[PDB]
Amino acid sequence: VEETLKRIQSHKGVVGTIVVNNEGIPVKSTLDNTTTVQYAGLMSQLADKARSVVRDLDPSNDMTFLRVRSKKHEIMVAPDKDFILIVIQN
Amino acid sequence: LKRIQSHKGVVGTIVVNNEGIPVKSTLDNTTTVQYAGLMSQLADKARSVVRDLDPSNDMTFLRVRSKKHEIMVAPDKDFILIVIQN
């Protein structure tokens, strides 16, 4: 939590961050609860599918992080011990 | 495209049409079918996730890093590009 987080949110271009525990519940978030739930659940779906895709292509391989770029932002989703970290940046 | 292939660390590339059919590949056909079909599923999930968050937004790039490689999917007009890099 604290050590990685503040550092990430203090990075140029970072506009939002969310930490989700291994049950999928948000633990820390810069966004309002309703938005938080949307990003967390949607990004968790995308991550779980990236994870399966990686293993389907190669059973000995393992996904480490996903980045989805769009017109308006880029979102990174990174497995982290007992947590998933979602970072939205410009 | 040729310039994509000749970038350091790039190990494979595939070009897929809007219908899901590979139009060019540096890989063999069986591998090409697996990457194309699985990356396409992932890209399609990424596209709808983007739209669900903001219906005015569109996905432009997807990068999946793993222990052994990184895989990039870029939507490009009437094609998708899939690049596997070390």
A50 touches chain B (CB under 8 A): yes
Method underlying the structure:
X-ray
* Residue for token pair 């996903």: A66
Taking the C-alpha atoms of residue A44 and residue A37, their distance in angstroms, rounded to an integer, is 10
Is B63's CB within 8 Å of A67's CB? yes
Distance from CA of A74 to the nearest CA of B (A): 9
Half-sphere exposure of A40 (CA within 13 A, CB side): 23
Question: How many residue contacts between A and B have a Cβ separation below 8 Å?
Answer: 75
- Assign residue A13 a region: left if phi > 0, alpha if psi is -120 to 50, beta otherwise? left
Taking the C-alpha atoms of residue B80 and residue B60, their distance in angstroms, rounded to an integer, is 10
Q: Pick from B49, B50, B17: which is nearest to B36 by CA?
A: B17
Domain B1-86 listed as CATH 3.30.450.30: yes
Distance from CA of A54 to the nearest CA of B (A): 7
Helices B29-53 + A33-57 axis angle, to 10:
180
Q: Which CATH number fits domain A1-90: 3.40.50.450, 3.30.450.30, 1.10.3720.10, 3.90.1170.40?
A: 3.30.450.30
> Could you tell me the maximum CA-CA distance found in chain B, to the nearest angstrom?
38
